[model samples]
Target: QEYIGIKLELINYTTLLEEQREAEKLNIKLPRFYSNPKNKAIFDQLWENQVDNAKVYLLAATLRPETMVGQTNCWVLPTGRYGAYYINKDEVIIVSEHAAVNMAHQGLNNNKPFGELDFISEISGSDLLLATVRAPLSPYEQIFVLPLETIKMDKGTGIVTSVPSDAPDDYACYKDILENRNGIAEKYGVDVGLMLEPYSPLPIIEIPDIGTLSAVRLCEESNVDRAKLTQIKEICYTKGFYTGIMKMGPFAGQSVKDCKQSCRDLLVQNNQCIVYSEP
Candidate 1:
């Protein structure tokens, strides 16, 4: 199977490089132009200044980046486990052990000379609550970190980014956490208002039969928990990708089937994401 991975900066690393003298110290320059390269480049002039090589990122894997224009934020399992696995001194990812091990074998830390996978610090999903992130291709610019009650640990990267406008599960999560923060927000020690404010679903696609906000519409019609939601997720995305049209973005009015590759290419070329596969 194939999965697409996007890098969303989880920390403000603009100045982190300068402070650590780290990027330079680590010679934070690795281009995976070799075996086990993980399709990564240390620095690209096209993306430089915009991305700091020294900062940590949350690797969000998605099959529907065409819906990225509508992304609201990212999600972590409130009680699930995670860690900041260091692919290199200057680069760290807050991901699950299952994912880190997979990437490690796939040449994730194969930064030219260095050839080993290492974990720098251990962190839980709970530690990241209310953290901020900068997602790529998103109009929102900066989004927040929140909890998802049902994020599976074995899923891609063990992290789920939110596209509330398109994904029914994401929409249901938004309603549960933001609309009624009493139990959800209270448990996390995050201000209910912070979790509630600063974002709205962006309109990125329109399915003729489903409309601009299919997720919102679906959730309103059905009340399903995790198991049913998983099944709905599979059905909704496969149909949406084939039937949806660009309601916003540069391809406004174009078919999702037509625009998906163009959008994916744009992200890859800009180094916003990488493509990988597994059994």
Candidate 2:
């Protein structure tokens, strides 16, 4: 399978990387902060030779780049174990070890030698919750990492980007967290308000009969909630693919089928997405 890996850059590094000295003492690789984002000129002034150029990206494999603008949050499994692997200098990817192996074999790991794990420190899925990241094409600059029990290690990336507006399953599940966070948020120890209030679905695709926010509309039509997401959300995929139109980004005003490639190309050109192959 050919999949697109979108880079979710870590902007909340201070919280995500809790113990720098402890990690370094163990010889574990980590992102190194350099200069101000405003001054690229000063980037050359300090830490020019640093190996891990201060950037960490969580790559989520998705089939739809067109829905990216609607991404409201990231989903990681509560019990899943994850790892940070060194792709190259100042850049690392955190994902399941199984997917990491495939990613390396597929030559997406910064072209590292085949079979070399390029391992870094272990990171738990629960620990990654509350982490703030910037999705490639989201309307919002930052989003939170939250828990999704349905994701598995064998899946695309064990990491799912939330697109509540256009993905029915996403809307069902994501909306549940937003509406009933006391239990879900407390279950994962995430800030309920942070997980829900700050983010809402971005309207990126409009379906002719389904209207804008196809996912939300479909969920309402199906009368589905978090419990029925797995059973009902799959239909929205076909509806959106066949009937959806691009409502934002450079592909705005175009149909999703015609603009899918443009969306993929945009992410690739911007260095926010990569093409990955699955055996």
Candidate 3:
């Protein structure tokens, strides 16, 4: 499947990295490769190079660029590790090793032949919690990173963009965080109430019967406690594409099917996103 690789520029480093630097020791929560002197040197080199020179972005793979205006936050697997891979002197893309290698093979390497990658640094997802990023097309100027334990490392860079307004899974997970039903936020040491106060689902697409906020409406009707999300998602995705209309952004009033490509193209043209494919 091909996905839009959304470039969420990191605005702040997580406290986890600071803690590791202060301790002058690597934690198991981080990549084991960092324990090697050579790997540590590579990280330091990139660190110094990016201090004032380049921007670091968490590469989030999303199929629905049209819903980007509704994005509330970014998702990461708290236990998994990610790496910052050099794309060029101007940009660094962070993702799982699997994704980085996949991207390299697809000719995303920096001054290197296909399949070769310049690994810059490794970061644990937990360490990235609460870190803020600037998302393209999102109404909010800044969005924070939060944990979603179900994130699959093999899929979509393992970095998912949260669009609770249209995606059922995203809406479910966002509800989980807001209610703190399972103490998920507390477990992650996150200030749920304060951190998430400014971000909320927005009505970006209008689907017949499903309403403008399809995901939120469906979740509420089905209770979502044991909702068959696959079915719900299929309904949303199908009806959304064929009948939904863009209700916000520059594409307002246009059919989703008509505006989807234009929205994706705009992001790509602006260097805010790139097209990525995987088998």
Predicted model with the maximum lDDT: 3
> By summed lDDT, which 10 consecutive residues of candidate 2 come out lowest?
34-43
TM-score of each prediction: 0.78, 0.81, 0.85
Q: How close is candidate 2 to the true structure, as a TM-score?
A: 0.81
lDDT of 2 at 42: 19
What would the per-residue lDDT of candidate 2 be over residues 93-199, giving only the tens digit for each residue? 77888888887786756666887687766667766776777888787868888888889888777888888887766766677677664576566666667556778
Top candidate when judged by TM-score against the true structure: 3
> Pairing residues by index, what is the TM-score of model 3?
0.85
Better of 1 and 2 by lDDT: 2
Better of 2 and 3 by TM-score: 3
Off by over 4 Å in 3: 12-52, 225-227
| Model 1 C-alpha lDDT versus the unseen true structure | 0.71
For residue 206, model 1's alpha carbon misses the true position, in angstroms, by 0.5
Can you write out model 3's per-residue Cα lDDT over 36-93, one digit (the tens) per residue? 2322343355667554446778899988888888889999999989887888777888
Model 1: ten consecutive residues of lowest lDDT: 33-42
Winner of 1 and 3 under lDDT? 3
